[PDB]
Design a binder for this molecule. Sequence first.
Ligand SMILES: OC[C@H]1O[C@@H](O[C@H]2[C@H](O)[C@@H](O)[C@H](O[C@H]3[C@H](O)[C@@H](O)[C@H](O[C@H]4[C@H](O)[C@@H](O)[C@H](O)O[C@@H]4CO)O[C@@H]3CO)O[C@@H]2CO)[C@H](O)[C@@H](O)[C@@H]1O
Ligand SMILES: OC[C@H]1O[C@@H](O)[C@H](O)[C@@H](O)[C@@H]1O
Ligand SMILES: [Ca+2]
Length: 420
Amino acid sequence: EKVDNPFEGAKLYVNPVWSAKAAAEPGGSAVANESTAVWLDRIGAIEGNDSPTTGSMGLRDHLEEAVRQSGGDPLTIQVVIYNLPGRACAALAANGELGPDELDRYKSEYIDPIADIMWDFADYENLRIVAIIEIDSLPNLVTNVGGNGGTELCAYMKQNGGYVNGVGYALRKLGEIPNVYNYIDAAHHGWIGWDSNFGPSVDIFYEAANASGSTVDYVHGFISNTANYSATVEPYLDVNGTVNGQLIRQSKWVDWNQYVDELSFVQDLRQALIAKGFRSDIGMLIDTSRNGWGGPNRPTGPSSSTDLNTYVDESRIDRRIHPGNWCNQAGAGLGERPTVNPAPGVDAYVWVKPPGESDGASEEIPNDEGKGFDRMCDPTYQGNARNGNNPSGALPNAPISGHWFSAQFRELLANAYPPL
Ligand SMILES: OC[C@H]1O[C@@H](O[C@H]2[C@H](O)[C@@H](O)[C@H](O[C@H]3[C@H](O)[C@@H](O)[C@H](O[C@H]4[C@H](O)[C@@H](O)[C@H](O)O[C@@H]4CO)O[C@@H]3CO)O[C@@H]2CO)[C@H](O)[C@@H](O)[C@@H]1O
Ligand SMILES: OC[C@H]1O[C@@H](O)[C@H](O)[C@@H](O)[C@@H]1O
Ligand SMILES: [Ca+2]
């Protein structure tokens, strides 16, 4: 009874809090009426906490504003569910208020009040709520547990079931509401694109969909590239191709990945998920908030070079040093503006990470948000295992994650692709 694609035939919510911030930047009015997802990054964001990350509007305020903007007609608002116990276990930049052992509080004081408020809007037939479920969670339990270079926190979160059970609980509690459309976060190709990660990610997504009373029927789809920068399509790069003998996969950039972009990745992932037992009518989202890679540095065509790495590095639109470089990435541009069904199996391109909001502090900044200083956000950081021992590529003088980052907004705007 829920529509096949909640983005289809709907006006998109414009967040007034985000809109004002964009509009106050030079030239920012050009994108200030774009739809971005509303993040519930703290229990305080539910009622509203006048914070640097969520401002003066609580969830009810946003849904009232969504109803107002709708004018009676179909309108879709995206709400990011983002407060798991031991949140973001592989990193420190977006750690949260709920510790590893606080699943009970996640249920009672976070998911339950959210569900309560959403139920109050169930009488608006044309309001659609897209719930984006727990970014940067489950894939960590595949790639950051055991072996070498993992974290004890991720190991613990796998052991105690907090991520799997927390996700299943969100899926059921929100999914049983008539106008709520759940999308599970699915990392990105430069995370779980490899053979060793792909299948196990599929399995853990299925496990979470069946935890805490959930079934696959509470899952409308999956989102990739959330708050990341991976290219939607690499127009001059073929993952299966070859440069003068040497395979594309042998390049430093691709490094045996099954994929070079998000589109091929989510289309294959969609098929795997259906095969695993997810509904055949699931659809994929791609966060294109920051993946346009436009401006003067954008390749205008494939390289003429016959050397493998030279060809790949000159041909790729994603210009990062390493695909594992995730924080405040230097040179990034706004990607495709939100678009309905742009490609086979894709419900929408969307702006989930709101452009101009930081990925993390570039230094030690005191806060009550539970957020530490992650060195992957430090421009001077020389890397580790999970990035091939490379410089971080992160922008200097960055504020706490979610805080307004003028310099990043301005560069994203300048590097928009397609141009504005
Ligand atoms: O997306 C925003 C989110 O990012 C989190 O960090 C993620 C990175 O986004 C992601 O690119 C990174 O992916 C790793 C992956 O975990 C490894 O399993 C994989 O290992 C490869 C290796 O690179 C190859 O040399 C080898 O041949 O194959 C193996 C696989 O078998 O490498 C990739 C790329 O580095 O994982 C990160 C998490 O650890 C942030 O933590 C978070 O803050 C952000 O919100
Ligand atoms: O900007 C969107 C979100 O980004 C996350 O990395 C932060 O931790 C949140 O506070 C913020 O709401
Ligand atoms: Ca569908």
